Point group: D2
Chain length 431, copies 4
C-alpha cells in the first residue's frame, strides 16, 4: 500500500492552487454586489470562462472520451484546493461534471461523442446539469407503492413528452434561463401522468433519462419550459439551481440516454455514488479553510494575554479535533475513489464505500468549522474573517447530493442488509 | 421542588407572545431593505419604541428601584418567546438590560436614582450598554502578568480621562453614534497609559467602571469619542456593537460607579454571571423555533413517499434529540436564575451554576438547529424557511457574552479548583 | 417554580446516605467471594433484610396503601444516594418497587390489601418482580401482525394456564428459585399457543397480568415452573434475573390483576413509564460516584507535575462536562416525576416526559463515567479504584428498563407523531 | 496512491487469522479457571510458546536485525486479526515488541546482536518490557521545573545504580517475577537520588535507559529488585504489568543503551510514537469484533418482530457509525505507520501523524463497542456474548500507551505550536 503522490498529482494541485489564488479570489468583488442568486450566478460567468481556459472543464471527462481527467484522486486534489479558496465557480465545474456523468457512464460511443463535444473543446462556457431533484422530495423516489418521481415521460409517436417539475439541479436553467448546454432529466415513465404510479411495479424499472439541450428547448413552445423560481440559499450564494416546470415538453427519441428501466436507474445511482465520494473533497476544502484560518490566528494572537492562544489546552484540543477530522476525511475520500476505480470489485462494495465517505466527510466538515469558530472566539463571527461564509457553505454538504439522513444512510443500510454483504471486501478482498 | 407557573408568569408569557407576534413579525419588512449593520439597526428603532410602550425596558429594572421586573423566571420566559420569533429588537432589550445591571447592583441609591430614570419612564427609546469588550480580546483581562485591559482611566482633577478602544458592546453608540443613553465603561486604572500593567498587582484591584451618558459625549471634543467601525455580523444582523476609540475623554468623578478594585470587578462579574444564565433563554428560543419548524414539517410532509417523515426512525431520532436538548436547557436556566436569587447561597455556588448554564445551553442550541435542518433536509437550506437565519443566529451564543472556551469554562474551572468547592450545594444546601 | 427541598426531603437523603455508608459498604466483602450470579445475589440477602428493617421496602408503597412513600422526588433523592455508593441490594429495592407497581396502580382495593401486605410489614425479605421480558425480545411485543409475547395464558375452568419463557426480570425466582413473593407475569392471551398471534387483532387488546406467588408455584407440579439459567452480567453482578419456563402452569382466576386487554396493557405501560423516570436517579448515582472520585483525585494529584491536574484545561473540561451532565440529568428526573404526579395533565404528556428522561439520563451517564476515567488516566483501569465497577454498571442503564433504541425512542416517537401532540404541555400547560 | 495488498500482506493476514482461530481460541479455557492477574498471565505461557513457534516474536524484529518483520502495514494487519479474536497472549507479543524497540532503534550493532538474540531464535518464551511508567504518573516527566521521573540512576565506578519504582510496564517481571528476558528501564540521572531535579536543566537532557536482564537481577541482592504488587485490571485480565521497586540495583555500564540525554529521550520518544500508531490496530481489532458480532446478530434476529432488526433505521444508524469509525481508523493507522517508514519526512511530521492516530482510533473504538451494544440491546450485557469482555478491553486504549488527555494531545499540541509546523507535510510533501 502507498500514499505517495506522483509528479502530475503534485502538478494538478499546484495548477489548481495557482488557479484559485490568481483567478477565484477576484470573484467576490464581482458577485458581492449583485441583488439575487441569479445575478450572483451571472456575475460568475467570466470565472467559469477562465476555468474552461485553464482546462478544468476538460479535466472532468476521462482521457478515453477525449478529456484530460487523469484519475479520481487527481480530481479529489483539485476539488479540495478549489473549495479551500472559493466555492463560487468551483461549484459550477463539479455541477457540470455530475451532468456529464450519465453520458460518461453509458456504453454508447456515438451519443458520448456528440454530447460531450462542447465540454472537451477548451472553449466557451458550456454548462451541464443532472436534473434529478423535485419540489416534493426524492428520498423516496424508488419506494415501491409510493408516488415516485413527479416528472414523468411518455412516448408519443417518435418523441418523448416530459411533464412535471425539478428543483435544485445546479446549472439547469443555464446562464440565461434558456437551458444548460446539456441537461440529463430523470423521469418516471407514465402513459397517463394523472394516474398514480402502479403500486405493483418496481419503480426502478420505470426510470428514463432524457437528454435536453438549448436546441431542444428552442424547438418547444415557450410555455413548455418555464423557470418558476431561484431559491435563495444560505451558502453557495453564487450557484443557480432553479425550479423548472415542463409542460408537454417534446424531446427526440434519439435523446433517450438508454432503454428505460434498471439500466437507466443504474446510471443515475453510479453518477450519484461517484459524486458521493467526490463531494467529500468539497467538504474537506471548506473545513480545511476554517482550520487553517483558526490555526494561523491561534499561533499569532494572545487574545490579550501573555502567550499565543494555541498554548491553551482547550484551544489546542479544538484544532487537534479539526485536524483529525480533516485527515481521516481525505484518507476516506481517496480510499473511496480508488475503490470506485477498481474493476475487480462488486458494485455494492463500491456503493457502500461511497455512501460512508459522503456521510462521514460531510457531517464532520460541519463540526470542524464550528470548532474552528469556537477556538478563534468572538472574532470568527464578523465578516472580516471567513467563518461566516464557511459556516453557511459547510451546512450544504450534509444536505446536498443526496441527504445523509434520507438517502445515503438508507442506501448504505440496504447494502448492509443483503445476505452476501462483505463488510471488508474493499480492503481485504472478497471471500 | 415544584415547577408550576404562576398566573403572573403565564401572563408574562402571553404578553411576550402577543408583542412578538403583533410587533416583531413586522420588523423584517423594514430592515431587509437596508444595506449595512447600522442602517438595519436604525430601522429597528420603531420596534424598540413599541417595546418601551409595552413596558419591556422597564420590566428590566427591579421593583425596589422603579421598574416592573417580577422575577428572573419571568424574564427567562419573556426572552424565550421573543427569541423564538425575532432576535431583532429583542437583542436590544437584553443589551440594554446588561448595560443597566452594574447600576442596578451597586451600593448607591443616588446613582441608582439618577441613571435608571430614563429606563423606568415608559417613554422614548433609551439604550444602555455595558462596555467591556476590546479589539485585543478580554478572556485574559484578569490575568496577573498580562497586558490587562487596553481601555484605561487616569484621575485628573475632579475628572477621569479615558484612553483606549472597545469592540462588540451592543448598543454602545446609541441610535446615531452620539452614544448610548447609559454606557458603563470597564477600565484598567493606569496613571501612565503608555506604561505596561505592573506584573505584581492583581489586575482585579485596578478595575473601575465609569458611567458615560450622551451628555458626557456632548461635553467633550468631537475627536475624543469616535466610532472607527461597525462589524458586519454573521447573524443578529440588526444589532450594533461598534468599534469605539476614547482619546482624552473626560468623565466627572461623580460618574464613577463605585470604588476601583475588587468591588468594581465583583460588579462586572455579577452582571456577566446573571447574563450568563439568561443567555440560555435566548438560545432556547432560537433552537425552539428550529425544532418547531422541523416538527411541523415532519408531521405534515411525506417527502414524496407514503408517510409523514416523522414516521422514519432516523428523522424522529433527530427531533427527539432536539426536544431533549431544549427541555434540559430550560430546566437548567430556571434552576440557574433561581440559584442567583437565593440569598442563602455563597457567590461561588451561583457563579458555577450560571457558568454551566451558559456553556450547556449555548453549545447544545447549535446542535439542535443543525439536527432540525438535517431532519428537514435540502429545503432547510433556502430562505423561504427560517433555518438559514437561525443557523447564523445560533452560532452567536457559544461565542458571545463571554465565550465558553476562553471565559466561562475557566471561570467554572477556577471555582471547581477552590479547596472548599461544594459541587451539589445549589441543590442539597451547603455543609 | 421552586427548587428548595423540604426538611423531610433532606431527611430522606440523610437516612439513605447513612444506610448506604453503614450497611451497603459491607456487602462487597460478602459477595466478592461468591463464584456466580446466584451466589452473589444470595450473599446480598442480609443487606436486603437491613433495607427492610430500615423501611426502604415500605417507602416503595404509597401512604394511602399503608406504605411510607412521601413522594417521587423523595424517591429520586433516595435512589441517587444508594446508587452513588452500591447498586447491590439497591437494585433489589427498585426491582421490587417495579414488581409492586401494577398492583399499586390498579383500582382494586381488595387485591391491594391482599398482595401488598408483606411489603408494608417491615418484616422478612419479601421480593417482587415485574415479569415482562423474554428470550426472543420485547421491543416489538405490541406490533400488530408480529408474533407478540411468547408467554401466553388461556382460561381453563376457574384457572389460567401459563405457557412459555421469561428472561431478565430482576428478583423473579426469589432468593432460592422457588419464586418471588409477588411476581406480575405479563402474558398474551391465547387459547392455542401452537397458533400464531392473530394478525388482525390489535396486540394490546390481548394482554393479561397474572399474580404468581410462592404459594402459586408450590401448588403446581414440580416441572411447571423451572429456572433454566442465570445470565452472568457485565455489571450489577449481584442481581438475579433468571431464565424461567412455564409449562402448563396453573394460576387461580382470583389472581388475574384485571380484565385482559387495554387496561392490562395500560398498567404495564404506566409502571414502566414510572420506572423510566426513576431509572435516571440510578444513572445519576453511578455517574456521580465516577465524577466525584475523579474530582477528588483531580484536586489531590499532580501526576508527577507541579500543579494539581484540575489545573490543566483538558482535565477541567472533562469534569465540567460530567458535572453538566449530572446537573441537567437530575433536573430532568425531578421534572419528570413531578410531571407524573400531576393530575391536571394527560397521559401522553407524562409518557413523553418520562421517555426523554430515561433516554437522556442513561446515555449521558455512560459518557460521564468514561470522561471521568479519561480525566484520571491509567489509574482508573485498576480495581483499586471504583471505575472498573462503575463502567460495567453504567452500561446497563441505556440497555435495561426498556432500551433507548428499540423501546423508549419508539414510544416517544409515537407520542410525537400524534396529531394532538403538545411539546411543552408539561411546562406551559395544554392549549385546550 | 495505492491501497492494494501484496501477496505477502494477504498471507500475513491468513497466518494471523489461522493462529488466532486454531490457537488463541483455546486460551480462555485455561486462564478463566484462574484467580488473579499473574496466574491468568502464567496460564497464557503455552499460547505465547505457540506464538514464538509460529514466528510471531521474530516478526517483531526487522529483517536487517535478523528478524522477519516485513513492514509496519504487515504488522498492523497481524495485530488487527489477533485482537479481533483474543487479546490474551496477543498483548504479550506487542508489549515485547515495544520493549525491544529502543534496542532495535539505537545504532549499536553490538547491543543489538547481544540483546535481540533470544527473540530471533524461534525458541522458548522470551519476554521484553519497556519500563517507563511510574506510580506517580508520567504525563509530566519532561516538565522543566517538575520533579521528573522518580526512578533515578547514578554512576558508581564502571556501573550504574538504580533507585525507584515502576508501575504498569507489561511483561516487566517475566513469567515468574525474576524479570523479563529484556527490560529497558528509563531513569532520570541523579547523583543524589534524594535531591530534587534541578529546575534549571531541561529534563530531556537527563534521561538514561538501562538494559536489565534476568542475569542482571540474579547478579544482585534478592531485595534490590522487589515486585510489590500486581494491579487487577478492568480488562486485559491476563497481562502482567507489576509494581516493581529497584533499591540500589547495580547494572554494568555496558548495558547503558546510549549516551544519557536528548538521545536516550529520543529513543523513548520514537519507540512510543511507533507504538502510538500500532496501538490503533489493537483498538480496531476489539471494535471490529464488537461490530461484527452486532452485525451478524442484527442480520439474523428479529427481536420478536416481523423483520431482522437491521431493517430499523435506528439500528442500522449505529452499525453505519461503527463501520465508519472502523474504516477511517484503519486508513489512519496504515497512513501513520507508512508515514513513519518514510525516510524523506522529518520526525515532527511523523510524530504528529502518530499522535493523531492513537487519539482518534482509541477514542472512537470505545464509541464503536458501546454503539454495537446499544444496537444489540439487553442481550449484549451478558457473558454468553463477547460484549462484556470487549467493553472492558476497549477502555484500555484511550488510557494506555500514553493517555490521550495527558500525553498524546500534549505531544501533538506542542508540534502544532512550532513556527515551522506543516499540517499537511505527510500528504502533500514539504
Ligand atoms: C451580538 C453581540 C453582542 C455582544 N454584546 C456585548 C456587550 O453588550 N458587552 C460586551 O462587553 N461584549 C459584548 N459582545 C462580545 C461578547 O461578550 C464576547 O463574548 C467578548 O468579545 C469576549 O469574546 P471571547 O470569549 O471570544 O474571548 P477572546 O478574548 O476574544 O478570546 C478568543 C478565543 O481565544 C481563546 N482563548 C483566549 N484566552 C484563553 C484562555 N485563557 N484559555 C482558553 N482559551 C483562551 C478562546 O478559544 C477564545 O474563544 C457582543 C458580541 C456580539 C456578537
Ligand atoms: C447547491 C446545491 C446543488 C445541488 N445539486 C443538485 C444537482 O445537481 N442535481 C439534482 O438533482 N439535485 C441537486 N441538489 C439537491 C440535493 O442533491 C438534495 O440532496 C436533493 O434534493 C435531495 O434532498 P434530501 O436528501 O433532503 O431528500 P428529501 O426528499 O428532500 O427529504 C428530506 C428529508 O426528509 C427525511 N426523509 C425523507 N425520506 C426519508 C426516508 N425514507 N428515511 C429517512 N428519512 C427520510 C430526511 O430527514 C431527509 O433529509 C442540489 C442542491 C443544492 C443546494
Ligand atoms: C439488571 C437488569 C434488570 C432488569 N429488570 C427487568 C424487570 O424487572 N422486568 C423485566 O421484564 N425485564 C427486566 N430487564 C430487561 C430490560 O428491561 C430490557 O430492557 C428488556 O429485556 C428489553 O430489552 P431491549 O430494550 O434491548 O429490547 P429487545 O427486544 O431485546 O431488542 C434488542 C434491540 O433490538 C433493536 N430493536 C428491536 N426492535 C426495534 C424497533 N422496533 N426499532 C428499533 N430497534 C429495535 C434495538 O436495538 C434493541 O435495543 C432487566 C435487565 C437487567 C440487566
Ligand atoms: C495493559 C497495559 C499495558 C501497559 N504497557 C506499558 C508498557 O509496556 N510500558 C510502560 O511504561 N507503560 C505501560 N502501560 C501504562 C500506559 O502507558 C499509561 O498510558 C501510562 O502510565 C501513562 O498514563 P497516563 O496517560 O494516564 O498519565 P498520568 O501521568 O498517569 O496522568 C493521568 C491523567 O492525569 C491528567 N494529566 C496529567 N498531566 C496532564 C497534563 N500535563 N495535561 C493534561 N492532563 C494531564 C490526564 O487526564 C491523564 O489522563 C500499560 C498499561 C496497561 C494497562
Amino acid at each position: 500500500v502507498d500514499f505517495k503522490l506522483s509528479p502530475s498529482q503534485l502538478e494538478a494541485r499546484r495548477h489548481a492552487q495557482a488557479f484559485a489564488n490568481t483567478v477565484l479570489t477576484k470573484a467576490s468583488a464581482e458577485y458581492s454586489t449583485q441583488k439575487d442568486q441569479l445575478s450572483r450566478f451571472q456575475a460568475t460567468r467570466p470565472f467559469y470562462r477562465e476555468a474552461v481556459r485553464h482546462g478544468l472543464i476538460k479535466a472532468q471527462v476521462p482521457i478515453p472520451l477525449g478529456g484530460t481527467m487523469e484519475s479520481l484522486v487527481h480530481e479529489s486534489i483539485i476539488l479540495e484546493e478549489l473549495f479551500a479558496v472559493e466555492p463560487a465557480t468551483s461549484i459550477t465545474i463539479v455541477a457540470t461534471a455530475l451532468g456529464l456523468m450519465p453520458v460518461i457512464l453509458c456504453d454508447s460511443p456515438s451519443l458520448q461523442e456528440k454530447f460531450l463535444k462542447p465540454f472537451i473543446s477548451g472553449e466557451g462556457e458550456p454548462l451541464a446539469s443532472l436534473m434529478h431533484s423535485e419540489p416534493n422530495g426524492t428520498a423516496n423516489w424508488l419506494q415501491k407503492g409510493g408516488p415516485g418521481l413527479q416528472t414523468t415521460a411518455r412516448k408519443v409517436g417518435n418523441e418523448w413528452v416530459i411533464s412535471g417539475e425539478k428543483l435544485w439541479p445546479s446549472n439547469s436553467g443555464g446562464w440565461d434561463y434558456k437551458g444548460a448546454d446539456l441537461a440529463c432529466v430523470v423521469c418516471r415513465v407514465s402513459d397517463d401522468p394523472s394516474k398514480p404510479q402502479d403500486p405493483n411495479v418496481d419503480p426502478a424499472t420505470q426510470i428514463a433519462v432524457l437528454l435536453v439541450t438549448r436546441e431542444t428547448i428552442a424547438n418547444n413552445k415557450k410555455d413548455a419550459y418555464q423557470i418558476l423560481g431561484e431559491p435563495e440559499l444560505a451558502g453557495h450564494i453564487t450557484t443557480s439551481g432553479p425550479h423548472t416546470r415542463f409542460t408537454e415538453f417534446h424531446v427526440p427519441h434519439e435523446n433517450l440516454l438508454c432503454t428505460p428501466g434498471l439500466k437507466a436507474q443504474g446510471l443515475v445511482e453510479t453518477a450519484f455514488a461517484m459524486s458521493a465520494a467526490l463531494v467529500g473533497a468539497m467538504a474537506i476544502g471548506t473545513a480545511r479553510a476554517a482550520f487553517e484560518e483558526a490555526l494561523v490566528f491561534a499561533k499569532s494572537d494572545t487574545r490579550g494575554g501573555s502567550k499565543h492562544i494555541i498554548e491553551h489546552q482547550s484551544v489546542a484540543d479544538k484544532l487537534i479535533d479539526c485536524k483529525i477530522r480533516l485527515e481521516t476525511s481525505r484518507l476516506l475520500v481517496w480510499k473511496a475513489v480508488t475503490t470506485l476505480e477498481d474493476e475487480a470489485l462488486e458494485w455494492k462494495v463500491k456503493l457502500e464505500m461511497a455512501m460512508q465517505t459522503k456521510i462521514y466527510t460531510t457531517d464532520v466538515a460541519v463540526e470542524c468549522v464550528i470548532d474552528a469558530m469556537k477556538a478563534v472566539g468572538m472574532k470568527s463571527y464578523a465578516k472580516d474573517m471567513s467563518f461566516p461564509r464557511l459556516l453557511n457553505e459547510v451546512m450544504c454538504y450534509p444536505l446536498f447530493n443526496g441527504g445523509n439522513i434520507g438517502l445515503r444512510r438508507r442506501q448504505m443500510q440496504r447494502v448492509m442488509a443483503l445476505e452476501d454483504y462483505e463488510p471488508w471486501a474493499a480492503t481485504y478482498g472478497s471471500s
